[PDB]
Every structure is written in structure tokens, then in C-alpha cells.
Design a protein around this ligand. Structure first.
Ligand SMILES: [Ca+2]
Ligand SMILES: [Ca+2]
Lengths: 20, 75
């Protein structure tokens, strides 16, 4: 149920913050 | 509005998945990352995750596909 994007936000939160 | 700083961050994230550095993320590399997070995916679940972003249908994720996905989430 987790997507590749979801896993990216877990392992690279800076990439996460940029997306949000 | 994708900046060079953002592309650098996304490339770094990509490299965290691309364990062997060959430029593609495989289901094996995805599984290694998931299990290190305490997850327990099947191969079919991993292939499902790849398929959602595998723009060219070759079964692995390259950096252009990864960047395209991150750029879409930005919009
Ligand atoms: Ca690889
Ligand atoms: Ca591909």
C-alpha cells in the first residue's frame, strides 16, 4: 500500500518537504 | 518551477534506493530498503510500486522516471 513516493518521504525527508 | 537545488535533493534520494549505483532501482533494491524499515513486502507488491512510476514499462525506475514522479507530486 506504500508507494515509492511514500518510501522516499521516509528515507529522504528533505525530498519530502520539497513535495509538500 | 523545479530548481537545481531540488533536482540535487531528488538525485540524492534516488541514490539511496539505487544501492549499486547502476542508475536504476530494481525490486530487489526496493525490497532491501523496505525491509530495513521493518516492512515485509512481496515481490508482487514491489513490482506494483515500480509499475506506478515506470513510465517506459521496462520494469525498473531510472532517474528521469523518479524525477518525473517527484515533480508531479510538487504540482
Ligand atoms: Ca540499481
Ligand atoms: Ca523504467
Amino acid at each position: 500500500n506504500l508507494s515509492l513516493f511514500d518510501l522516499t518521504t521516509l528515507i529522504h525527508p528533505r525530498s519530502a518537504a520539497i513535495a509538500s | 518551477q523545479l530548481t537545481e537545488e531540488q533536482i540535487a535533493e531528488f538525485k540524492e534520494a534516488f541514490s539511496l534506493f539505487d544501492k549499486d549505483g547502476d542508475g536504476t532501482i530494481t525490486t530487489k533494491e526496493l525490497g532491501t530498503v523496505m525491509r530495513s524499515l521493518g516492512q515485509n513486502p512481496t515481490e508482487a507488491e514491489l513490482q506494483d510500486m515500480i509499475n506506478e512510476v515506470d513510465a517506459d514499462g521496462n520494469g525498473t525506475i531510472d532517474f528521469p522516471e523518479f524525477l518525473t514522479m517527484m515533480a508531479r507530486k510538487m504540482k
